[PDB]
Symmetry: D2
Subunit: 171 residues, 4 copies
């Protein structure tokens, strides 16, 4: 038997433990087109049709973006774009309305409601019209059978849409 004394400098009294953390992935799309018909006299949308190129996704992370294009997500080779088509605008007041339309994600189509909030209807620098509005609403991955492989535990069934638009008159 012999007696020893730690050397605290080359000793580590260590432990490892596993925890879960919840976090929001924030994303946008760099490339999309839209057609916008709005009547400032009555604060009503008449047509809103948007096409978004899945390819142009950006979640501030290059390898996740690529991953989004694959089978277990967007399948961007087969379905390069997502579309929204307005079917009904129901005015609440001049700042607010309920927009109903058809969202199409990888060939699957559902009717969704977005909350329109009109934040500013002006004549511009030059005297041609501008508008600023937001569209907000929650959609369910399950409704669109999006990422069906991924559990609703790992990744939320709920996606929150925040469309912020500034826009100028045509011709």
């Amino acid at each position: 038997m012999k007696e020893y004394t730690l050397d605290k400098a080359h000793t580590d009294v260590g432990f490892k433990i596993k925890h879960l953390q919840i976090s929001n992935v924030k994303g946008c799309f760099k490339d999309y087109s839209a057609v916008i018909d709005f009547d400032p006299a009555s604060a009503e949308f008449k047509k809103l049709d948007v096409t978004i190129k899945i390819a142009s996704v950006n979640t501030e992370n290059q390898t996740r973006d690529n991953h989004l294009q694959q089978d277990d997500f967007f399948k961007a080779k087969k379905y390069p774009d997502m579309t929204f088509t307005m079917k009904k605008y129901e005015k609440i007041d001049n700042e607010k309305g309920k927009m109903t339309g058809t969202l199409t994600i990888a060939g699957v189509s559902k009717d969704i409601v977005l909350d329109a909030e009109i934040g500013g209807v002006a004549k511009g620098k030059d005297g041609k019209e501008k508008i600023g509005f937001s569209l907000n609403g929650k959609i369910k991955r399950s409704d669109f059978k999006f990422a069906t492989s991924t559990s609703t535990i790992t990744l939320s069934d709920d996606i929150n849409l925040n469309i912020e638009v500034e826009a100028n008159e045509k011709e």
Copy 2:
């Protein structure tokens, strides 16, 4: 009715989605004492008694460390230290054995098994003895009623102990 054209520069076609991520918290304790009796002739531990000052925890994050001291964790005001006392060393060979002892976390005591791995038994620079060994084992929070408030979902019931020791002879 009027027609508009997005201004892509002040437009954001955005989304937010919630996901879970698993991660290991790695930690050590800066301040502990130990008594170590080991026989290099037979590669057997004779006594191993460790006291660890909960206060000296370090998980590379100052506010989590403080939080560990509180009611829902260590209760370091009431129970400032954790103790390990060896009860039995069962040799497997000269590199390996099973250590049994009593771990005490905030006044609750359980007998645990650690895997002893002896990685090097030498005479030092000066001709006095040194040893290097590790102790590894998994304990369950539930066995010690540690952090009973915190779900075994958020934070793992399993804690992995990695004690890495270098040590020098006495007097």
Copy 3:
């Protein structure tokens, strides 16, 4: 050395593995009062004030119900009731409107929006009025600092309100 043969009848080649499962807790309250002012001429609510006795919760499970009354939930000893007070009804059409009001959970008050859906405005068996409507909306535990101890991982930050009302005229 000796050779053996399993006895399959008293042998178990076993394993245990831990998984997560997501589930909806559905609940109602057995005891509540309300005041309801509605104009069938215009399909508008004029007053809607509801008080709910926390004590009367029912999630089809007796010990969870009790648990809901405690500090980490409702604190029903201190705050026996939750209240909703309508502040604004904004008509969309005769079947649909947006209701705004003040919800109060254990002394904390936030303004919420419910989606009113009027499903049937009749004169009854006896020739006195009836109405049937629903109120639906999502509130966040965090907005009300409800169950702050419980992680948004274990238990969803989002609660979905489904109020289904059938109701008869007064006097």
Copy 4:
């Protein structure tokens, strides 16, 4: 305007909220073979070779069992069986030892340690030998690239092996 009174009998003041629950899946295999060489004189295993038919899995649930056979699990069409081959038995005492062997799950092989606990070495009813022992140990899905598609969040990386054997001498 008109005043109404709830009809509590056809009114539901309801809510829905999502929570996580952790649970152990317990399982065994109905069909396996083994070869067992054990020396009661010295309480040492000499050979332990087990083959398990993946097809014979039973987790007390018929549709989960089928699911286990598929690509995201066992791939039982391609890899119908799992094998264990003892490489080393290291005696601790007559009741206890450390078993080392090669586990093979769907063509991927890793060396694992099981804790042998010998609970009873007798001569039987008839005067021929019997033994009862257990083998226990934890393996990691990740080490075997098992169910790589399934997150370590939904389903634990750790599987706990409990082999309980009763067995009788040969010829």
